[PDB]
């Protein structure tokens, strides 16, 4: 019952490749994802207002 004791937390959000390339040093291994089509074909939950 206290957030400071929590061991882990997970957030699912929506991004495009431009944000990831804003910081080239931080993010690696981007080549495997296929941006030509929807490579995250499944997006579990992530209830969003986007149609």
């Amino acid at each position: 019952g206290d957030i400071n004791k929590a061991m882990f937390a997970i957030v699912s959000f929506e991004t495009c490749k431009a944000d990831l390339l804003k910081e080239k040093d931080r993010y690696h291994n981007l080549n495997k994802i296929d941006w030509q089509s929807s490579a995250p074909v499944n997006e579990p939950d992530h209830a969003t207002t986007t149609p």
Binding site: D34, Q36, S37
Partner: protein
């Protein structure tokens, strides 16, 4: 048994239905023994249909199944992929069902 003409006819039917194309074509790399792949759809097959597809011949008698090692460079490999025939990229599903 499936043949090249069946795959061509299925592609023609899907183009008529105005079904969108899942993926894009691949231009070759600079490495020797690497060939282009103009396949823009995805097909799911069982594991025990793969040998028959591998033995398939095209209209002029050439090989119809192109393995992933040829176009791994200058392209991406979807999970579970085994090769490409005509317009389709074949993906092998280990637990695919059938009518017996």
């Amino acid at each position: 048994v499936v043949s090249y003409k069946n795959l061509m006819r299925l592609d023609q039917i899907l183009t008529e239905n105005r079904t969108p194309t899942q993926t894009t074509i691949i231009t070759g790399s600079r490495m020797i023994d690497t060939k282009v792949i103009g396949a823009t759809r995805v097909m799911y097959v069982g594991s025990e249909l793969v040998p028959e597809l591998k033995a398939m011949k095209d209209l002029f008698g050439n090989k119809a199944f192109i393995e992933t090692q040829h176009y791994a460079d200058a392209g991406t490999i979807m999970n579970g992929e085994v090769g490409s025939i005509d317009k389709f990229r074949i993906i092998q599903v280990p637990e695919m069902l059938h009518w017996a």
